[PDB]
Amino acid sequence: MLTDNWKELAGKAQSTFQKSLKQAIELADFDEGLAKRYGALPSAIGANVEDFGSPAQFPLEEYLKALPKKVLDITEKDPVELLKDLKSRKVTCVEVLKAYTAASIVASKLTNCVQEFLPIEALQYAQKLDADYETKKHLPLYGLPFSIKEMIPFVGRSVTHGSLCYLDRIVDYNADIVNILIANGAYPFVRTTNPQSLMMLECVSFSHGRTVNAYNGMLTSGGSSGGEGALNGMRASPFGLGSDIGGSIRCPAAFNGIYGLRSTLGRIPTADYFSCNRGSESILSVTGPLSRSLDTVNLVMKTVIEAKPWLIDPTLVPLDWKRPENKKFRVGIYVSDHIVNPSPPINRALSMVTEKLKSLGNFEVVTFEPYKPEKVTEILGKLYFEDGARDFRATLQTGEPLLEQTRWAIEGAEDLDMHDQWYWNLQKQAYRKEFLKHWCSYTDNDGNVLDAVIAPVFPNVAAKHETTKYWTYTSQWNLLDYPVLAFPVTKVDESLDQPYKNYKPLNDLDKYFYEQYDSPSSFKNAPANLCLVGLRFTDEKLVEIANILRN
Amino acid sequence: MLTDNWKELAGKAQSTFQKSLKQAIELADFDEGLAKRYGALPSAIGANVEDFGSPAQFPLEEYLKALPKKVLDITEKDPVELLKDLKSRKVTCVEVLKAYTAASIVASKLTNCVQEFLPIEALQYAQKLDADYETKKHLPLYGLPFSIKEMIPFVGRSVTHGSLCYLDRIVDYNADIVNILIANGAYPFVRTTNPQSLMMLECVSFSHGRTVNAYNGMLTSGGSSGGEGALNGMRASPFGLGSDIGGSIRCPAAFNGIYGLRSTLGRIPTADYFSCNRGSESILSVTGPLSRSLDTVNLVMKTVIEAKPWLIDPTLVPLDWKRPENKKFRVGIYVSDHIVNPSPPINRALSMVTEKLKSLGNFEVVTFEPYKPEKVTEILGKLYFEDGARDFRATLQTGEPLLEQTRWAIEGAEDLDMHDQWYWNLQKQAYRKEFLKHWCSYTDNDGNVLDAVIAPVFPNVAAKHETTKYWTYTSQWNLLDYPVLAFPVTKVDESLDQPYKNYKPLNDLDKYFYEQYDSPSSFKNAPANLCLVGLRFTDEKLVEIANILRN
User: Which residues catalyse the reaction (chains A, B) (predicted)?
Assistant: First the structure.
């Protein structure tokens, strides 16, 4: 840990970003027309980490306008299809790198989703991938760059999870999942932004400033993997890796209208990531990919697991990544937990998806009721910061200010005695066992279990800044460790999504979210996503059902 | 002329081009990446002059993808801005030549717009211009290359206007306008294609094959300055010189979405060009610039006229090139001649330009009715080929086939007796006098004359091959000798430009053009241009109004 003044350290972080941005622009080699249009874009990057700039109203429109067809023809192509072009040599690995690097630079300025570009090592990866074309063409991800959340170790970099005090914490190794993906023909080219404490569903830190939504620049990108959500929502990366302990993969994915998988704990390696509360095991985070392309999420999962990562990380289970053979499906619709009702755009998305599943013959669709959702907050309120947030709070010895959203996550945290931890571990495992019984109560007379549940990711589309005051719609599945896949449905419609009249709130917090949704014009063009929830290790069922919903 | 078999001569024409193409590639000095992409481009050049190849759907998109930043940063620059860099020595005369030579090579393969490159003399011009930088820094076109239609004499070259029989017609001199432009720091670097007889609004000859549109390769470039329209539409030349006796400058410019000025006869020297019917004076062609850049059009006229060309060509009038001091404008909109109605894309261009002028306070906008447009065809029907096309048909003694478009131009040609010419000269002068009275009938109560008329250039955007069967929208102003400036407005919009419903044709020829517009997709991405018409010697009013329309 460092104890230097935070203002000096924020300088050092900005400098690291700016030096890599300069190198990124050199690699992309803009012609003067693009350099001009790029220069004139509204920036979400300020002069310092407390100045949040002036974001575009519709960053994706600005991105698609600014970039030349010569770049978009690569970055807008579905990554699995792009893998065919790299395999057949219609495009070089270095060519793909240049396009996506340029895309990420435009994305960085509009959304502020990049913490550090990796142009030096990425060119080395792509060049020798071209040189070794004949020997590595067979690899499942040959030539594809990808993004990694800053919390993921990469050789020679500091790993801070957004905390300035860790700027001298340099690693000489990559995370296991990074090396596995590299062994399969991929390589990271950019590090995405992460917020203070990582326990925020937004993306504000004193290492980068504020990250904004790819579809509406007045809204949050989400968090904790906010840079990944913004970068991949802008299609400026084929896919990315985030982490998810309270919604930190699915919230960015849903807010930015893309796919994001909270994978079951123990399938893919994440423990070598850096966060707060290192060594805490009561509730464990997971990783998983974010991408515009469901086929790319599936291929990344398939690639890492078929590399048998349990022979490097022993917390993992040797369970194959397998397409489910079920042709019939039983699916529940989780319309509300009856604590905070979803806003109109989320409710319309639930109806759309309900109607589509009912129209297909092989889906039986039932209502799914909550089971003690208040119990989610009680337990996670004790286990998220089980040291009373001492480990996080010590990071602020630099004077780094405490953000409003971080305040919520550490409010009330108890420094548990061993017997207190034991008490709540028993509360955790009992709730898990009770909920399984609840889930199995929906099995039919013939003995067919529920395959998946469809639920919101958040009580609304991308939230206004400093308003993500309810976690249960995502953290429920972290307490249970159920795999959850966020997927796109629709966008806000100003005609269809007017506020409910004569709404009677369920409680003060539901009242807060009701008044938060003042009108759809406040959320123009915001994607309305949902998620598919499955029992532990049924990840593949979720991919298969999402496949049907997009056809 | 020559009397050899035409197939041998077409070979000789192809050899001259291929010999100059080889020298151009050496001058351009491709690196391997460009040489590779150039080799793989779809060509509008065939194996022989009757084989038209397989052109790209969007030649311009292919051009922008194929050429490097090292080239596009110069050729995409507005030539007036590029002149600043040449003056301040931020860029070399040879550097600019190399970029534009490379651009024209790529443009040549994609659109077939180059008849002969001039890289030997161009390198000599550019090299000594660099050497003489300190003494020639002041010249208004210092360092700028430009293209010339093949009909324009250049030292040591054959001048054929596309007729194979004239391949032994070598000149030892440049055209007056060329020498003037050289005296002002410019130099020609490429010769562009022209069609058989020059009397078609397309660009097909047995010297080069078929020239295609820069924006949609299934459509014609226009003619007769078809190479000029394509080359400058691809922005592969800073500007070019064409000729216009029936629309042969404005039709290429309009089809390729750039500017083209049919300047008033008697301003800039053109008589030393070569065409058919040399010595025919009943209807005289004019020259004028084509360019992507309006500012470049204005500067060439200013440069040539300020060189006092009436001291070399005595047919010219000593009238300064002067920007008008008008603060108010009266402008007419020519919606139709009520013989052939414009297609939807042109019709929307008229409304767009109308609504823009009405939105500025200082424009009075009135509807402009036609005046006996049928008399245009009748008079031009007698005076275009007043020898009964005897001179042109003698070019076919080589066996050179008669193209379908040429057939239209010479069908019905009478070999006029002197009294017949006198009769039609009087008809010509009477119509001009009647039309002036028509124009002046639009003068308002305070005595303000119409400053300009906005009219179509053609009943449609760039035509499908062998369908340019109506000339009046351009030849009207050749009969009258009014200055006309073609200028860009919009592109085909597939939503907005669906065919007219419940359309009732005005006559057989109008029905033909209606059926020609089968759907906007047949003309995807084709520019919709219009033109500004002024009274004789008001060229500058047209430039000034075009300036306002593009801001």
Answer: 149 (charge relay system), 224 (charge relay system), 248 (acyl-ester intermediate)
Q: Which of A32, A68, A69 sits opposite B73 (nearest CB)?
A: A32
Quoted resolution (Å): 2.7
Residue found under tokens 């579905």? A78
Could you check whether the bond before residue B224 is cis, i.e. omega within 30 degrees of 0? Answer: yes
CB contact under 8 A, B76 and A33: yes
Q: Which residues of A are less than 8 Å from B69 in CB distance?
A: 29-32
Q: Which residues lie across from A148 on neighbouring strands?
A: A191, A241
Which of these, B440, B457, B179, B187, lies nearest to B313 by C-alpha position? B179
- The β-bridge relationship of strands B363-367 and B286-291 is unpaired
Among A224, A275, A293, A343, the active-site one is: A224
Angle at A400 between CA A399 and CA A401, to 5 degrees: 105
B78 touches A: beta carbon within 8 Å: no
Annotated ligand binding at A522? The verdict is no
DSSP strand pairing (A363-367 vs A329-333): parallel
A-B C-beta contacts closer than 8 Å: 18
Q: Are A287 and A194 spatial neighbours (Cβ–Cβ below 8 Å)?
A: no
Label the pairing between strands A484-491 and B114-117.
unpaired
Q: Do B61 and A69 touch (CB under 8 A)?
A: yes
User: Whole-angstrom Cα distance, residue A170 to residue A421?
Assistant: 32
Is residue A290 annotated as involved in ligand binding? no
Distance CA A208, CA A204 (A): 7
Helix axes of B539-550 and B294-305: crossing angle, nearest 10 degrees: 160
Q: Exposed/middle/buried for A87, CB within 10 Å: 0-12, 13-18, 19+?
A: middle
Residue from A215, A213, A211 nearest A58 by CA: A215
- Of B496, B534, B476, B486, the closest CA to residue B256 belongs to B486
Chain B residues with CB under 8 Å of A32 CB are: 69, 73, 76-77
- Find out whether A160 and A207 touch, Cβ atoms under 8 Å: yes
Three-state SS letters, B72-87: HHHHCCCHHHHHHHHH
Does A224 participate in catalysis according to the annotation?
yes
Which residues of chain A make contact with B64, given a CB cutoff of 8 A?
A: 68-70
Kindly report the three-state secondary structure assignment for every residue of B289-325. Answer: EEECCHHHHHHHHHHHHCCCHHHCCCCCCCCCCCCCC
The continuous run of DSSP H or E covering B426 comes out as helix B418-440
Name the DSSP letter for residue A387. B
Q: Are A106 and A201 in contact (CB under 8 A)?
A: no
User: Looking at the annotation, which residues of B are catalytic?
Assistant: 149, 224, 248
| Phi and psi angles of residue B78, each rounded to the nearest 5 degrees, phi first | -55, 130
Q: How far apart are CA A325 and CA A233, in angstroms?
A: 31
Distance CA B285, CA B179 (A): 20
Nearest Cα residue to A117 out of A100, A130, A131, A94:
A100
Q: How was this structure determined?
A: X-ray
Question: Which chain B positions have a beta carbon within 8 Å of A33's beta carbon?
Answer: 72, 76
Whether B26 and B59 have beta carbons less than 8 Å apart is answered as no
Q: Does A29 touch chain B (CB under 8 A)?
A: yes
What is the amino acid identity at position A322? K
H/E element, A475: helix A472-480
Write out the two tokens for A284. Answer: 């464990």
How far, in Å, CA of A483 to CA of A304, rounded? Answer: 16
A51 inside 8 A of chain B by CB: no
| Euclidean distance between CA atoms B111 and B62, whole angstroms | 11
Q: Which two tokens stand for residue B112?
A: 């077939």
State both tokens at A510. 């539901």
- Cα radius of gyration rounded to whole Å, chain B: 22
Nearest chain A Cα distance for residue B101, angstroms = 19
Residue B247 labelled as part of a binding site: yes
Looking at residue B495, its amino acid is S
Question: B248 a known binding residue?
Answer: yes
Q: Are A218 and A111 in contact (CB under 8 A)?
A: no
